[PDB]
Every structure is written in C-alpha cells, then in structure tokens.
Design an enzyme around this catalytic site. Sequence first.
Site, mmCIF file in Angstrom:
data_model
loop_
_atom_site.group_PDB
_atom_site.id
_atom_site.type_symbol
_atom_site.label_atom_id
_atom_site.label_comp_id
_atom_site.label_asym_id
_atom_site.label_seq_id
_atom_site.Cartn_x
_atom_site.Cartn_y
_atom_site.Cartn_z
ATOM 1 N N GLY A 208 -67.573 67.482 -24.450
ATOM 2 C CA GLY A 208 -66.631 68.399 -23.825
ATOM 3 C C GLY A 208 -67.133 68.955 -22.505
ATOM 4 O O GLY A 208 -66.396 68.998 -21.519
ATOM 5 N N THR A 209 -68.396 69.388 -22.469
ATOM 6 C CA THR A 209 -68.957 69.935 -21.238
ATOM 7 C C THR A 209 -68.929 68.906 -20.118
ATOM 8 O O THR A 209 -68.397 69.160 -19.033
ATOM 9 C CB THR A 209 -70.388 70.413 -21.480
ATOM 10 O OG1 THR A 209 -71.116 69.397 -22.182
ATOM 11 C CG2 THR A 209 -70.400 71.695 -22.290
ATOM 12 N N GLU B 166 -71.445 53.956 3.320
ATOM 13 C CA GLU B 166 -71.380 52.501 3.320
ATOM 14 C C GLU B 166 -71.223 51.923 1.922
ATOM 15 O O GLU B 166 -70.655 50.833 1.782
ATOM 16 C CB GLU B 166 -72.621 51.911 3.992
ATOM 17 C CG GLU B 166 -72.682 52.195 5.481
ATOM 18 C CD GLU B 166 -73.883 51.584 6.166
ATOM 19 O OE1 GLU B 166 -74.729 50.989 5.471
ATOM 20 O OE2 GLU B 166 -73.979 51.698 7.407
ATOM 21 N N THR C 201 -73.291 58.968 -31.122
ATOM 22 C CA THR C 201 -73.751 60.188 -31.770
ATOM 23 C C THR C 201 -72.650 61.207 -32.016
ATOM 24 O O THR C 201 -72.879 62.167 -32.758
ATOM 25 C CB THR C 201 -74.855 60.853 -30.937
ATOM 26 O OG1 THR C 201 -75.202 62.114 -31.525
ATOM 27 C CG2 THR C 201 -74.380 61.079 -29.513
ATOM 28 N N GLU D 272 -73.487 75.724 -22.462
ATOM 29 C CA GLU D 272 -74.523 75.997 -23.445
ATOM 30 C C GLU D 272 -75.764 76.540 -22.755
ATOM 31 O O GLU D 272 -76.211 75.977 -21.749
ATOM 32 C CB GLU D 272 -74.891 74.732 -24.220
ATOM 33 C CG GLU D 272 -75.326 74.981 -25.654
ATOM 34 C CD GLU D 272 -75.549 73.694 -26.425
ATOM 35 O OE1 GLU D 272 -75.113 72.627 -25.945
ATOM 36 O OE2 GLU D 272 -76.157 73.749 -27.515
ATOM 37 N N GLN E 279 -75.374 68.570 -21.296
ATOM 38 C CA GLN E 279 -76.736 68.312 -21.749
ATOM 39 C C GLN E 279 -77.297 67.053 -21.113
ATOM 40 O O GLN E 279 -78.415 67.055 -20.591
ATOM 41 C CB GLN E 279 -76.782 68.186 -23.269
ATOM 42 C CG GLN E 279 -78.139 67.780 -23.803
ATOM 43 C CD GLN E 279 -78.379 68.273 -25.211
ATOM 44 O OE1 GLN E 279 -77.475 68.261 -26.046
ATOM 45 N NE2 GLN E 279 -79.602 68.714 -25.484
HETATM 46 N N1 GTP Z 1 -78.584 58.886 -21.390
HETATM 47 C C1 GTP Z 1 -78.642 60.079 -21.971
HETATM 48 N N2 GTP Z 1 -77.542 60.574 -22.636
HETATM 49 C C2 GTP Z 1 -77.591 61.784 -23.237
HETATM 50 C C3 GTP Z 1 -78.742 62.542 -23.181
HETATM 51 N N3 GTP Z 1 -78.512 63.687 -23.848
HETATM 52 C C4 GTP Z 1 -77.247 63.672 -24.316
HETATM 53 N N4 GTP Z 1 -76.662 62.494 -23.949
HETATM 54 C C5 GTP Z 1 -75.282 62.064 -24.232
HETATM 55 O O1 GTP Z 1 -74.384 63.069 -23.799
HETATM 56 C C6 GTP Z 1 -73.287 63.159 -24.681
HETATM 57 C C7 GTP Z 1 -72.716 64.574 -24.733
HETATM 58 O O2 GTP Z 1 -73.145 65.337 -23.629
HETATM 59 P P1 GTP Z 1 -72.732 66.886 -23.465
HETATM 60 O O3 GTP Z 1 -71.244 67.062 -23.330
HETATM 61 O O4 GTP Z 1 -73.420 67.421 -22.239
HETATM 62 O O5 GTP Z 1 -73.285 67.687 -24.750
HETATM 63 P P2 GTP Z 1 -73.377 69.300 -24.695
HETATM 64 O O6 GTP Z 1 -74.277 69.805 -23.600
HETATM 65 O O7 GTP Z 1 -73.783 69.868 -26.034
HETATM 66 O O8 GTP Z 1 -71.867 69.725 -24.361
HETATM 67 P P3 GTP Z 1 -70.698 69.504 -25.433
HETATM 68 O O9 GTP Z 1 -71.110 68.417 -26.392
HETATM 69 O O10 GTP Z 1 -69.450 69.101 -24.700
HETATM 70 O O11 GTP Z 1 -70.447 70.790 -26.181
HETATM 71 C C8 GTP Z 1 -73.820 62.714 -26.030
HETATM 72 O O12 GTP Z 1 -72.865 61.935 -26.709
HETATM 73 C C9 GTP Z 1 -75.042 61.877 -25.718
HETATM 74 O O13 GTP Z 1 -74.772 60.527 -25.998
HETATM 75 C C10 GTP Z 1 -79.851 62.052 -22.514
HETATM 76 O O14 GTP Z 1 -80.879 62.715 -22.458
HETATM 77 N N5 GTP Z 1 -79.799 60.821 -21.907
#
Ligand code: GTP
EC number: 3.6.5.-
Lengths: 52, 431, 48, 50, 50, 430, 49
Positions: free
Chosen positions: F136-137, F246, F171, F63, F11
């Site tokens: 996880g992703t 570089e 979170t 997802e 995400q």
């Molecule tokens: N800087 C930033 N961090 C983000 C944003 N959206 C999500 N995150 C962070 O990304 C973390 C998890 O990312 P993901 O693993 O991709 O979440 P997901 O797509 O639902 O995949 P899973 O949680 O593994 O099932 C979260 O703990 C957030 O803190 C964003 O828009 N900007």
Amino acid sequence: PDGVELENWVEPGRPRTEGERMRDLIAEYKLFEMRPRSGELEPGARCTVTIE
Amino acid sequence: MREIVHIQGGQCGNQIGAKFWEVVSDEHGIDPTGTYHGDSDLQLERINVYFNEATGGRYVPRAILMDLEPGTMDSVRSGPYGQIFRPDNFVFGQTGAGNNWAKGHYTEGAELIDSVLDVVRKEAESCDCLQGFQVCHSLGGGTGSGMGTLLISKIREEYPDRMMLTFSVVPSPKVSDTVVEPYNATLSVHQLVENADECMVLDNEALYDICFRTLKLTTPTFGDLNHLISAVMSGITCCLRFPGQLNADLRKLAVNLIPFPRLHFFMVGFTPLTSRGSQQYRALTVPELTQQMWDAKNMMCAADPRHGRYLTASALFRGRMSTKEVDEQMLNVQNKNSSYFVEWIPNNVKSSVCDIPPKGLKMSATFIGNSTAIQEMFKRVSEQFTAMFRRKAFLHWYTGEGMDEMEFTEAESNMNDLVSEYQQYQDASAE
Amino acid sequence: RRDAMLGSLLGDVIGGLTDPNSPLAEAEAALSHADKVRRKKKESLHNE
Amino acid sequence: RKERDFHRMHHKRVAQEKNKLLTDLRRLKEHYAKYEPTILELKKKYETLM
Amino acid sequence: RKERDFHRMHHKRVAQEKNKLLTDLRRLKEHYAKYEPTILELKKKYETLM
Amino acid sequence: MREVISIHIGQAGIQVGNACWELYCLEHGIQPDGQMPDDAFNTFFSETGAGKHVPRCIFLDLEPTVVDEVRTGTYRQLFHPEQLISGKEDAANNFARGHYTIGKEIVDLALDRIRKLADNCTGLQGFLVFNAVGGGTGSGLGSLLLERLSVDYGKKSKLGFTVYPSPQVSTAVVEPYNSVLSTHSLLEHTDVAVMLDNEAIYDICRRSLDIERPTYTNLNRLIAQVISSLTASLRFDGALNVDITEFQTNLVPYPRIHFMLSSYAPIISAEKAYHEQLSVAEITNAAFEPASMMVKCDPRHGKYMACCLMYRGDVVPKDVNASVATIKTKRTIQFVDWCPTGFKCGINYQPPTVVPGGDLAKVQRAVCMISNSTAIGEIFSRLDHKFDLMYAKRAFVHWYVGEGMEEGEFSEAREDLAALEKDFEEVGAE
Amino acid sequence: ARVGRPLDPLLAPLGGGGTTLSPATLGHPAAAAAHAQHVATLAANGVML
Ligand SMILES: Nc1nc2c(ncn2[C@@H]2O[C@H](COP(=O)(O)OP(=O)(O)OP(=O)(O)O)[C@@H](O)[C@H]2O)c(=O)[nH]1
Ligand SMILES: Nc1nc2c(ncn2[C@@H]2O[C@H](COP(=O)(O)OP(=O)(O)O)[C@@H](O)[C@H]2O)c(=O)[nH]1
C-alpha cells in the site's frame, strides 16, 4: 416465495418505488392470499381455489 | 508509537493476561517493580506500545484487569508480576457470575461496564496513536465471555476504525469443564462475529495435546498453557515493537488474512516448541520450523487443518534469517499441499520477518492460519448447543437474567451461517 | 455576506434536523427498516 | 448446484457489505447528533440577543 | 435451479440497495460537513452582536 | 548543475535507498558524518557552508519503524531530519489506505520538502523514485506522489525503479491487487519504469554470487549498483556520456511502452573473480543472457526493441562495438523489424566502486543493460490472471472499499493492464 | 507556439487537442463522461463485472 429455503437471508430492503412497496406491504400483512398455490388435476376434477 | 490497549477478562483471561505481561516485561527487560533492567536499546525503543512511563523510571502496563469476583485479581496481584499494573486498572465486582453469559452480559456486567469503559477511555486517550485493543478471555464462562462480548461491543461502538484483536479460549471438544459451555460459546461467537475485527480460537485440549506430544511435559498445569498462549500473543505483535526486515502490523495481518469479513477466526501455533529431551537433537532451521508450523499437532486449535482448506496463512518469523529462505519454504509448502489450499487465491502466504527473536531462542515463528477446518469446531459446538437447547436444559438460568429466548436462536443462526460460508468457500471452485 | 451565508447554513441545518425530505430522514428510514427486518427475522426464527 | 453456490456467495457478501454500510451510517448519525444540540442552543442565544 | 434464480434476483436487488445507500451516505457526509462551520459562524455573530 | 532528486517510498524503497546512499557515499568519498576529507557530488548531494554534504533525497513512509532505523543508524548525521518523513499508521498492504486516507497529509508534506530540495538545484535532470509495487505504501502513496510530481514539476524526467511481484514466490496476499492498481496508476506518470523481481535477483545471488542464502540487504545492494551504473554518466565523465534525458529518447518508442529490463554484469564473488577474463565481449554476452536479468522474464518469448548499455571502467568503444555486433549477429537475440539500430551505447571511465562487506568483487569493467523488449508483457500477463482469479469472488475487496475505493477502480485497473498487454502484443507484432 | 494537427483523421473527434486550458476542456471530457456514466449504469443495475 418460489419454494426456496431462506436461512438468515435479509428480507427485501426498502424498495424506494411505490409499486414495489405496495407489493411488499401486501406480502408483509397477507393482504392477498391464495390457499392452494400449486395444484394438479385429473380430467374433469375440481380444485376449489380460494383467494382472500 | 502505535499503542495497544490490553484487557484481561474472566479468571482464565486474567491468568493468561498476567502470564502475557510477565512474558512481555521479561522480553523487554523489565523487573516486576517496573524499572528497566534489560541493557538493550531496542527494548526501550518501542516500549511505549505496551507500557507507559510513570513519574519515575517505572513502566506501567497499558492493561485493564476486569472481573466480577475479587479472588482472581487477588491471585493476580499476589503473583510474580502483579505489582506492575496500576491499581485503578483493576475493575472488579463483588458477586461473580455462575458461568452465566446472561449474568455477565446483562445483569451484573451492566453496572461494572461503565467503570470498565471509563478506564478504557482514560488509557486510550493518553495514547499518541492507537493500533487498537486486545482482549484475552475464554469462551464457555459467565463473567469472562459475558462482559468480554459486552466490552468488545462498546469499544467497537466507540472506536469503529481501531483494531480489535480477541484471544478467546473456545471450550474443548472432548472434556468440557462446565455444563453451560455450549450456551456461552454460542452466545459469545454471535457477538465476536459482528464486533471483533480479528478473533483467535484456542482450545484447552489442543493445548494439552501439543504440550504433551511436542513439549513432552509430564504435569502440565494451566500455567504452561498460559505461557504458550502468552508466547503466541507476544509474537503476533513483535513486529510493532522491534525492527523487522519485512515488518507487518496488526492491520496488515488482518488485511492479508481476512478474505471476507465474517471469516475472521484464526488458529495459531508457535515454533519451535521443543521438548527438553530433544532440544539438542533438533536443528534450528527455517525448514524445521516451517515443518513444525504446518503440522496439525502444532496448531493450538482443536480442529485439524487437514479436514478443512486453508483460506489464508500468515507467518511472523523472528530472528536473523533469509527472506529468500522463508519465501521458498512457504511456497514449497503451498505447492506440496496445494490440495489443502484454496484455489482461487494464488498465494495463501503472508510472510513477515522480525529482526529480534525471543530470548533464549535463536529463531522462532508464530503461525496464524485462516482455514475452513474451524468449521468442524463450530459444528461441534452447534451439535452440543442444539441438543441441549432441544430440552432447554439450563436455559432457565439465562432466562432469569432478562434476556430473550429468541437470542439463543439468533446466536445459533449466526453461528451456523458462519459454518455455511466456511464450508462453501472450502468447496468453492475457480471460474 | 456573513449574514446571508449564516442564514443559509442555519436553514440547511434546521431542515436536515426536521424535514420530510432530508438526508437524515432517508438515513433514519433505512436504519429503522433494517432494525424492523432484523427483529422480524429473529422472532420468526425463534418461532420456527 | 455449482451455479446456486456461486450466486449464493455473491448475494451473501453483497448483503454483508450493505449491513456494514448501515452500521457506518448509524455511527455517523450518532456522531453528529452529538453536535446538533450545540447548534440549537446557539440559535436560542442568537434569538434572545436579538 | 429455483435457488440459483432466487439468489440471482436477490443479489441484484441488494447490490442496487447498496448503491443507493452509498449515494445516501455521500449526501449525509456532505450535510454533516455543513454542520460544523455553522457553530463557528454562530459564535462569531454572537460575539459581534454582543 | 546536473542534480537528480531521490525519493524512497515504503519499506522496500527505503531499504534499497539505504544501499543506494551507502554506495553513493562510498563512491564520492562522503563520510557518514556528512563531510568528506570536482563537483562530482552535486548530482546527489548539496554541500553547505560548513562543508557538510547533505543528500538530495526524501524518505517517505507511513510506517515509523523503517525511517527510525535510518534515524538511529550510521547515517543519522548525514540525512536531513525533516527530509526523513515518518507516518503514524501503516498502509497495511492497502492501496486505498496509502492513496486515499493516510497518504494525503504525508504527500503534502513530501511536496513541501521536495519543493525545498528542488529550489536548491540549479538544474534538475529529474527524479529517481524507488518504491515497491505490491504494498500500500509503495503502491498508493507512491502513485499519489508520482501523479503529484507529474502535475506540478511536469517535464522533469521521473525514473521509477519499481519492484513487481515475482511469478510464483510472494510475501503478500493482496499483492496482485495492489500491484495491478499501482501499475494502473504509474502507466501514465513515470517516464521510464525499471522492472525488478525479487525472485530473479534471488536466483542471481544463488547462482553467480554463489549465495545460497540471499536476503534483502544483498538484493538492495545489487539494485543500488544498477542505479549507480545508471547515473555514473551524470557524475563522472567519459566517452559516450549518456544523460537522464537521453535515456527516454533512446529507450521509449511509444509513450506507454516505457518499462525496462535491467541486467548487470558481472555479478561474481571475490572468490570466483580473476578466474575468467571478464572481457567486454564476455560481459556483454552475460548481460544479454536470458537468465541474467533482475526480472523473471525470458526474452526468447519476445523480441528486443531497444537496448541501452552503460559501460563503466576500462572499456574502449571498439570493444563495445565488436561485442554488440556479435550480439546482433547472434541468432538467439532477436530485434523487432522496425528498429534496425536498437542500440544505445554509453561508456564511462569510472569503474564500479565496491561496498565493503558486500559480495560483489572489484571488477574493472561493468555493464548495465536497460532494455525495452516486448517480452516483459509476460509478467503483466501473470498478474492479470492472479488479479481476476481473486476478483471472481472479490476477496479482500472490502478492505480496499473501506478506505474510499470503489469496485470501478478495480475494474478500470484490470482494463488498463489488459490494455498494456495489448500494447505489448502490437509492439511485438509486425 | 501551440501546435495542433488539423488534418489528422483520428484526432478530429477531439478537435486537434492542443492545450484546452479550461478545466472543463482538459483531457477527454466526452470520453470520461461516457465511460463514467456507463460504469454508473452498471453499478445502479447491479451488473457486477
Ligand atoms: N527487493 C526488495 N524488496 C523488498 C524489500 N523489502 C520489502 N520488499 C518488498 O516490498 C513489498 C511491500 O513494500 P511496502 O509497501 O513498502 O511495505 P510497507 O513499508 O510495510 O508498506 P505497506 O505494506 O503498504 O503497509 C513487499 O511485498 C516486498 O516484496 C527489500 O529489502 N528488497
Ligand atoms: N489456559 C487456561 N485456561 C483456563 C485457566 N483457568 C480456566 N481456564 C479455562 O477457561 C474456561 C472458561 O472459564 P472462565 O471463563 O475463566 O470462567 P469464569 O471466569 O467464571 O467466567 C474453562 O473451561 C477452563 O478450562 C487458566 O489458568 N489457563
């Protein structure tokens, strides 16, 4: 048992070792039993322990 | 595209499920005839999660209504949203269980359970991807709790990996409806611990307290309680159905919530629950909603969080908001109330945000708390079950249903073991 | 080659179905022991 | 008492994981005992055809 | 003290049992995987012999 | 001729990729439809016979919702439909789920498309992997993909722009767990890893953009600006052109130590703009301010080892040299004894383009500081306690075990981040 | 050209590194085997880390 209360705690599992499984069937079917278990004796007393 | 199969069981479960489907269809802009009337693309974007498209534009809910007596299904069908459900999904018996869990799990549920599983398999196989099953019912009742535990066990056997979500209405602390409530609750908790991956405790008296003190309602019928429970049951999965800034599915919630497998019982509350009088006087802000969230009165479960310790807490917010705002608010809550929070978990917050709030509300939030407080509810049900089992009053009706007396001891032992893990992880120290 | 590999796999499968020392044999031993333990604990708890 | 509680919870969650492994083993055994009769029938057909 | 010693010993025992069950489950997964090609091989041999 | 393949996982990766590709399209004039009304786009887009330019990117996720948002949004005719890859079941914050069970077929298809994309590039400067350490992703699938790319593509430089969990605010609950696991995974695969913290970017938005109301769109826009400044030398010419190859040779002293603080300057709203001179010296000092980083890590605890400055816009080398000399003579800034130079200056004549609807102002000068410093070990020290505190009771371990992970994996990951702590200690020490 | 260090005292246990292109020779087989065996012994003894 060493005087410990067991509360929904699983029995010893499959020992997979012959000596331990002999011990566990002994425990299950009360093959060897000593009745008094722990005791205390004054000087010269007689306890009359029984092992069956 | 990640589908959920809904099941409604018992009279209370069927009523709650009917209210839930009314709420979901209204949220998706579906009229009781099944045609879409929402005029919004996002509503139809993920409508497949709960509904299937019929031959025409009609959408049939992926719901299965189960009962031993036909009266509850007749009332449900005569209700406002009774005609959406497929008739083949109404699986009913002829003789109801007289609040006998043994009758609802062994004698009369055995014949109907084959048809129930047949309908469940038919509904599940049509799904492209299956997130899992959600079963809504009430603890303390014969038909509902009985076949509910039976069906949960059967579906656990069939689909071990698929999600199981249960919404059980636990018998109320102070005022009990039926006498055999502690028997039924103890028998059902035993099955729910082993089978249900995620389980919800709800209490009717807690529902009355929240609807009388926060909502300030005058004559709260069962419909209002069902409406609140339906709102929570929608908000738990709105992330699946709508785009979210930080989305979280049911399995993500379960992973982030369940520290240890047997401690999977959770309590909810919904925000913002505002009385009609003070709707204008309140301000819809994340700090307001979180303050209402962490209040003991907002909890839909009888146990108050103050006695126990919060193992984990997830919050699914809905609306256009700041993830910074939400994270700061909940971190501040954890720091302020760190005494109530378990020490050996550095962060007890699982925050999710969805971009689509419910209709009429600019913003909303559902809370799912795993806290050691529910220990006192399990303890109270034990204090009733043990007392009445000491004299075996009304044990004999259950003994007549071909179930062993040793099963009551089994259920009590498992339930008090769960009490033991709740207490010890409440009083557990780091290092 | 096909005949040899077919015979090997058939022998392995039939032995797994019925062998004194087969993974199914260990699995059933473990699960039967677990069921016996659960029954004994539950009946003992009821008696107590 | 603190040491007892620590060793307790360790033993309990290890036992719970063992029970889960047992349940998964049961599920796999059922899932493949479903398949085995087909192998038996095909073996019978093979013998008859020889 | 008696309880903590007791639960330490049984925690160790159940951990060992869990490891043994894990190894057994791996072997069982291997054998179950050996099952499903046999059906296809038997079907091909059946067709050729027919 | 200087193509760089972009990968966005999870995400957070996909959501920062949204901002990144909005920024690149605005920078090169590529309209959302796919075509624009020399050859400066080739680094990020491949032009077709019809004139439509398709980005050399890949959106990987388990997802479907995040990718479907792209498939429905304004950038539906730009991205390649098969390049958008969508899973069925989310990793559910489970590294084992995203690395062992669900991620296999997804990463296989991902490498299929990645090979197709790399065949269309004459040269290949490297990869830009944007994932989210802490899910996880991002963790599991991102780690699997990074391993896969290291094994097959090999010596192509992979820049992993990872977001680690903030010290206090977070979170997720198993976020320390999967962050430790993915750091364990990416310590040996990525060539240069860029550290980001949501808390630090939130503070930047609160304090300098005066955004009391920070959100993910703003965070991702800032990250996109940082990456665009990083890649400006590939697409636009200027004095002191610095290359993707570089970066690592000017920034990585030892193979393991390749995690990098990133700092942009200025971060000022349109209202506060043109109240300060924003000279080269002032913006360099702002970049070297301990507060200005996108990671919650004070340099004053540590010492700088290398600092690569990327200037954009009306910047003259005497000004960059004067500013950096003043920085060196400053007492607060401290370098390691064994790196007397420790400075990699690079300029570009293209000022940073501003995304309409954003808060960043039109500034004729921009600085992106990517620095290797021994201070960054502090954040790993934080996670190393966050992890073992839960691992004492092994909470949530059953979830990870269920999808084919063993307690040995957790132990090895903890050992590895302890090793990384020791690496930072020894690089700091004399 | 393939380059290995024959005089480095610390690299002597590996034997100069190089390519060791055979799969059984890849990386650090002895170190990996020893570490995995030690972890296996701990797991089989139930000595939780
Ligand atoms: N800087 C930033 N961090 C983000 C944003 N959206 C999500 N995150 C962070 O990304 C973390 C998890 O990312 P993901 O693993 O991709 O979440 P997901 O797509 O639902 O995949 P899973 O949680 O593994 O099932 C979260 O703990 C957030 O803190 C964003 O828009 N900007
Ligand atoms: N919220 C809500 N609770 C109900 C409703 N109807 C019954 N209950 C509660 O559900 C509990 C169990 O009843 P139930 O299981 O449905 O009876 P059964 O169908 O005969 O098994 C009772 O204690 C009731 O207080 C309803 O419409 N709404």
